[PDB]
Symmetry: D2
Subunit: 116 residues, 4 copies
């Protein structure tokens, strides 16, 4: 698991379950190419997006579909989604956890980067 | 003012209005002495708490009555209050803004310390 | 202004000054069109981006050049930029403040939407 | 583990290791009685503070010693500590995770409450 996403709900005090996440990687022509996608589990975690072999150097975009999450709960939120954009693996392989804390008009994101 | 407090609501995307705020100063016997208090305005801001003459170096505590705020909106929150404890230092810049961003099960706080 | 952007620095406890901000509007073909831009002032604020006449309903993206900000302080940051994507809706209140709080490996953003 | 504390460092993009945490419980005479203490591990987590039997109903204060953490790293931070104050177990036993994200002039805290 070189790439993991974890999402929490600041209104309910709970993991954010069933949040859709789409990952893109910037291509040689400067467009965002689809790279991996999934949804958070009952623990708010999304595991298994990619592998060490496939997760090469690049600029990645992790799109967290916060609007779909809030609307599936019947609430009207402010943001369309949360985008986390970063260069990965430029000094060799690392393990990345992208965490997000969600409210209807606010979110926070942080990264935990470790060296295996 | 040397000290200003600003409170925001992450659920509704609005200032947090009519929130009670109490400021205390640590006394020599390690107890908290009342220092100043008020309620946030329509902009979420509380001005006029103290003066330069009165705001000497020391340890201060800002207590924000977040539980009453959420209950008046019909929401059951997690925290009893939000407390911000810091040292005022004359070497640093002269004006302190204590900002807090509120959700039912979370809050964040940051200090903006500037010189006019 | 109908749209204002404010950026704060969580490491130094200060406004984030001279941060580049680009605003885009989603066009009918799903591409991002340049809409407005500027640099934050000494207060961390960027005023005057647009007018009521120009700021019609639609999807907007605010891109904050956080990577350049940290590099000019001699700090290597995680994110390429911070992006805030939202729908402007005439039914809601009239003035939007997009606030962001920056650290090298995290950021938060909140929307304060008010009526004068 | 009915009570767990997790702490992250937003400057380093890492767990906050070796953070001291003191938990207090409000006594019948309205004072804060020491309840449990410990320090975060290499994963930023603090396990084993208490037991189901001992973690009765009450108002608890979780004090996270952020100043000692930053100073042990040679940095001068703003806050003395972070205090998280909440009523626990008022509707029967629950499991509580208190999470905190730290920067020198800012912190965020959230709670995850689950029913075993
Ligand atoms: O396990 C976890 N990991 C991270 Cl990174 C956060 Cl922010 C929160 C939790 Cl509970
Ligand atoms: O957590 C926070 N986030 C933002 Cl965006 C602001 Cl302006 C202030 C705080 Cl304390
Ligand atoms: O003036 C301010 N405005 C906003 Cl919107 C935030 Cl989040 C924080 C501050 Cl200090
Ligand atoms: O402010 C915060 N932000 C994030 Cl992303 C997590 Cl996981 C936890 C907290 Cl307290
Ligand atoms: Na390289
Ligand atoms: Na009860």
């Amino acid at each position: 698991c070189p790439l993991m996403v974890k999402v929490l709900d600041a209104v309910r005090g709970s993991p954010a379950i069933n949040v859709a996440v789409h990952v893109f990687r910037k291509a040689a022509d400067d467009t965002w190419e689809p790279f991996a996608s999934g949804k958070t589990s009952e623990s708010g975690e999304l595991h298994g997006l990619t592998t060490e072999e496939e997760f090469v150097e690049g600029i990645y975009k992790v799109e967290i579909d916060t609007k779909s999450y809030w609307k599936a709960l019947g609430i009207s939120p402010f943001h369309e989604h949360a985008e986390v954009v970063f260069t990965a693996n430029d000094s060799g392989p690392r393990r990345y956890t992208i965490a997000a804390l969600l409210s209807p008009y606010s979110y926070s994101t942080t990264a935990v980067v470790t060296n295996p």
